Design an enzyme around this catalytic site. Structure first.
Site, PDB file in Angstrom:
ATOM      1  N   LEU A  25       0.784  -1.211   0.000  1.00  0.00           N
ATOM      2  CA  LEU A  25       0.000   0.000   0.000  1.00  0.00           C
ATOM      3  C   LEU A  25       0.824   1.272   0.000  1.00  0.00           C
ATOM      4  O   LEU A  25       0.401   2.378  -0.335  1.00  0.00           O
ATOM      5  CB  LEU A  25      -0.905  -0.008   1.249  1.00  0.00           C
ATOM      6  N   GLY A  26       1.988   1.242   0.621  1.00  0.00           N
ATOM      7  CA  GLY A  26       2.977   2.262   0.810  1.00  0.00           C
ATOM      8  C   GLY A  26       3.671   2.714  -0.455  1.00  0.00           C
ATOM      9  O   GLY A  26       3.755   3.925  -0.685  1.00  0.00           O
ATOM     10  N   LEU A  27       4.013   1.819  -1.369  1.00  0.00           N
ATOM     11  CA  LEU A  27       4.629   2.198  -2.640  1.00  0.00           C
ATOM     12  C   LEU A  27       3.637   2.861  -3.586  1.00  0.00           C
ATOM     13  O   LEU A  27       3.992   3.476  -4.608  1.00  0.00           O
ATOM     14  CB  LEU A  27       5.239   0.972  -3.331  1.00  0.00           C
ATOM     15  CG  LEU A  27       6.056   0.024  -2.435  1.00  0.00           C
ATOM     16  CD1 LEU A  27       5.622  -1.411  -2.725  1.00  0.00           C
ATOM     17  CD2 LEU A  27       7.549   0.246  -2.611  1.00  0.00           C
ATOM     18  N   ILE A  29       1.802   5.599  -3.218  1.00  0.00           N
ATOM     19  CA  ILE A  29       1.368   6.916  -2.768  1.00  0.00           C
ATOM     20  C   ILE A  29       1.544   7.914  -3.880  1.00  0.00           C
ATOM     21  O   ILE A  29       0.753   8.850  -3.963  1.00  0.00           O
ATOM     22  CB  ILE A  29       2.075   7.336  -1.476  1.00  0.00           C
ATOM     23  CG1 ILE A  29       1.948   8.825  -1.202  1.00  0.00           C
ATOM     24  CG2 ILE A  29       3.539   6.914  -1.572  1.00  0.00           C
ATOM     25  CD1 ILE A  29       0.538   9.386  -1.140  1.00  0.00           C
ATOM     26  N   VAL A  33       0.553   1.819 -10.148  1.00  0.00           N
ATOM     27  CA  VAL A  33      -0.388   0.700 -10.033  1.00  0.00           C
ATOM     28  C   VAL A  33       0.171  -0.480  -9.257  1.00  0.00           C
ATOM     29  O   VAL A  33       1.105  -1.155  -9.700  1.00  0.00           O
ATOM     30  CB  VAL A  33      -0.849   0.360 -11.437  1.00  0.00           C
ATOM     31  N   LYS A  48      -4.666   1.397  -8.236  1.00  0.00           N
ATOM     32  CA  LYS A  48      -4.088   2.723  -8.389  1.00  0.00           C
ATOM     33  C   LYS A  48      -4.592   3.664  -7.292  1.00  0.00           C
ATOM     34  O   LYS A  48      -5.802   3.802  -7.098  1.00  0.00           O
ATOM     35  CB  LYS A  48      -4.407   3.312  -9.736  1.00  0.00           C
ATOM     36  CG  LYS A  48      -4.240   4.791  -9.906  1.00  0.00           C
ATOM     37  CD  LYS A  48      -2.795   5.216  -9.666  1.00  0.00           C
ATOM     38  CE  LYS A  48      -2.428   6.373 -10.596  1.00  0.00           C
ATOM     39  NZ  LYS A  48      -3.051   6.124 -11.923  1.00  0.00           N
ATOM     40  N   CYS A  95      -6.353  -6.364 -14.083  1.00  0.00           N
ATOM     41  CA  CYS A  95      -4.921  -6.390 -14.281  1.00  0.00           C
ATOM     42  C   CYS A  95      -4.489  -6.818 -15.669  1.00  0.00           C
ATOM     43  O   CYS A  95      -4.946  -7.812 -16.236  1.00  0.00           O
ATOM     44  CB  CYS A  95      -4.489  -7.365 -13.181  1.00  0.00           C
ATOM     45  SG  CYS A  95      -2.734  -7.623 -12.981  1.00  0.00           S
ATOM     46  N   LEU A  96      -3.624  -6.069 -16.339  1.00  0.00           N
ATOM     47  CA  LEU A  96      -3.117  -6.303 -17.683  1.00  0.00           C
ATOM     48  C   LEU A  96      -1.612  -6.594 -17.572  1.00  0.00           C
ATOM     49  O   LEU A  96      -0.833  -5.693 -17.266  1.00  0.00           O
ATOM     50  CB  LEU A  96      -3.264  -5.102 -18.590  1.00  0.00           C
ATOM     51  CG  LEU A  96      -4.669  -4.534 -18.797  1.00  0.00           C
ATOM     52  CD1 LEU A  96      -4.556  -3.016 -18.839  1.00  0.00           C
ATOM     53  CD2 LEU A  96      -5.286  -5.079 -20.065  1.00  0.00           C
ATOM     54  N   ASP A 141      -3.989  11.690 -22.942  1.00  0.00           N
ATOM     55  CA  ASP A 141      -2.697  11.169 -22.517  1.00  0.00           C
ATOM     56  C   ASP A 141      -2.334   9.853 -23.226  1.00  0.00           C
ATOM     57  O   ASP A 141      -1.736   8.908 -22.655  1.00  0.00           O
ATOM     58  CB  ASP A 141      -2.761  10.874 -21.016  1.00  0.00           C
ATOM     59  CG  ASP A 141      -1.373  10.636 -20.456  1.00  0.00           C
ATOM     60  OD1 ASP A 141      -1.122   9.870 -19.513  1.00  0.00           O
ATOM     61  OD2 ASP A 141      -0.500  11.263 -21.073  1.00  0.00           O
TER      62      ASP A 141
HETATM   63 HG    HG Z   1      -1.653  -5.646 -12.361  1.00  0.00          HG
HETATM   64 HG    HG Z   2      -3.913   8.362  -1.527  1.00  0.00          HG
END
Ligand code: HG
Ligand code: HG
Ligand code: HG
Ligand code: HG
Ligand code: HG
Ligand code: HG
Length: 319
Positions: A25-27, A29, A33, A48, A95-96, A141
């Site tokens: 969860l930390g990575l 921020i 994804v 995400k 998930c791709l 984008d």
């Molecule tokens: Hg994924």
């Molecule tokens: Hg957040």
């Protein structure tokens, strides 16, 4: 058509539904994804993270309402939770894992990328934009980091992700917005055909591509070499870049022989795999440059907010 359910941001904790590692969860921020797994089904799934707020919730409303196309990644769950002290907008996505489009092409033993695949792919991507554009969404984008394969093995599907600049083309905003997608399609189809971006200049001031849309001064590869690219392939990649008012329409694109009667276009082997392979860095360089080009072309709106403070009628009062 078919009325479909409205988006409902589940408010409960996300970790009682999916195994957010609460470590992993930390990575997430800065918005990378990460991967979670549903609890009572133990299925795949991407996550995400976004700072919750209107402008993150608008784009997630946007992407949510375009899960439909088979050519758009699928958002499965939206959660509005309190992570750390903030308020997080946690979007769970199919998930791709098949790969990043050019990261697939780039690595080929020697299979060789062939113009007809270049066409099949352009219909795919043009499918997405033709979807988005008929329901008044402008993605803005559309670039290599955002076109990913589904599975890995054959039969893989190509879909676009990252709606964090996606805006409502509906109210000059019809044309302008929409045209950042057409430009990207001109830029992708050229790298696809040559292996190089349409970012070369020989003429005068080497104005950049981003700025080139606000005007000043696009050239093609040596007629012989890999420029085997039909003069019909040249006009279309050119019409897709002119930005003025005489800009192409996604219908125009999709109403094109090369596009539409694709998978019939010749299988002219191409130099794309070689170039991207031979300098994995100038490819990274090309990527940064389209990111940049996109950021300088996009025009966005914003409300005016003036500060207020109380008028000091008598600086000697109890106040
Ligand atoms: Hg994924
Ligand atoms: Hg957040
Ligand atoms: Hg925000
Ligand atoms: Hg669609
Ligand atoms: Hg696509
Ligand atoms: Hg634009």
């Amino acid at each position: 058509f078919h009325v479909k359910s409205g988006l409902q941001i589940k408010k409960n904790a996300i970790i009682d539904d999916y195994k957010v590692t609460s470590q992993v969860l930390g990575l997430g921020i800065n918005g990378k994804v990460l991967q979670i797994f549903n609890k009572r089904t133990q299925e795949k799934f991407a996550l995400k993270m976004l700072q919750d707020c209107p402008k993150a919730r608008r784009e997630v409303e946007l992407h949510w309402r375009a899960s439909q196309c088979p050519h758009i990644v699928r958002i499965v769950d939206v959660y509005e939770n309190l992570y750390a002290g903030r308020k997080c907008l946690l979007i769970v996505m199919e998930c791709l894992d098949g790969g990043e489009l050019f990261s697939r092409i780039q690595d080929r033993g020697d299979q060789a990328f062939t113009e007809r695949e270049a066409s099949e792919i352009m219909k795919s991507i043009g499918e997405a934009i033709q979807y988005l554009h008929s329901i008044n969404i402008a993605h803005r984008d559309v670039k290599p980091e955002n076109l990913l394969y589904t599975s890995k093995r054959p039969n893989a599907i190509l879909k676009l992700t990252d709606f964090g600049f996606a805006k409502e083309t509906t109210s000059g905003p019809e044309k302008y917005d929409k045209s950042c997608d057409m430009w990207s399609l001109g830029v992708i189809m050229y790298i696809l055909l040559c292996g190089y971006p349409p970012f070369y200049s020989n003429h005068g001031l080497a104005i950049s591509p981003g700025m080139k849309t606000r005007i000043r001064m696009y050239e093609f590869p040596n007629p012989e070499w890999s420029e085997v690219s039909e003069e019909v392939k040249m006009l279309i990649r050119n019409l897709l870049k002119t930005e003025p008012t005489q800009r192409m329409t996604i219908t125009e694109f999709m109403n094109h022989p090369w596009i539409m009667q694709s998978t019939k276009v010749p299988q002219t082997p191409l130099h794309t795999s070689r170039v991207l392979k031979e300098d994995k860095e100038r490819w990274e360089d090309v990527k940064e440059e389209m990111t940049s080009a996109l950021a300088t072309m996009r025009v966005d709106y914003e409300q005016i907010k003036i500060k207020k403070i109380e008028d000091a009628s008598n600086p000697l009062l109890l106040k």
